[PDB]
Amino acid sequence: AMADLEQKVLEMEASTYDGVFIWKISDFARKRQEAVAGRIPAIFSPAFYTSRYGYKMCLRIYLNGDGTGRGTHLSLFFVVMKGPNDALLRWPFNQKVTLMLLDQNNREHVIDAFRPDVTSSSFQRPVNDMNIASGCPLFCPVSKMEAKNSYVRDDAIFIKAIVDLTGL
């Protein structure tokens, strides 16, 4: 239990309820290589919400791309999880999602954004613990970071997500 209880704590400790979420990833290097070596391809982020009793969402990232971005890009995906209050929410999930890679030298953040495809199975009321991830396979070119630049400082990167709240 102690194990599962510690997971609940960290989850709570990380969760936010205004559709804004900043994901800090430490042990960049190590987690970077693991992605390369195919040992640990992806990494889920803690869950966050659009409101106190809003939608439950999280992010999934491949520090060494997935699909059209494999080995070359950094893929970042938005994930619509099954929320304890889904039956009170309007479906399909139709909220603009902005994703960013923060520049710890605040001079040029890597930003991208998209509007949910209402037909996709990624924005339909969850039946599983999580829906299928969808986002940006070519979010940012490995070289754009890795080496040095200004996105990886003290071996750590920050991913930021902003789920627009229009209509909520």
Partner: peptide, 5 residues
Amino acid sequence: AAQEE
């Protein structure tokens, strides 16, 4: 949005 493979 492009689902993950």
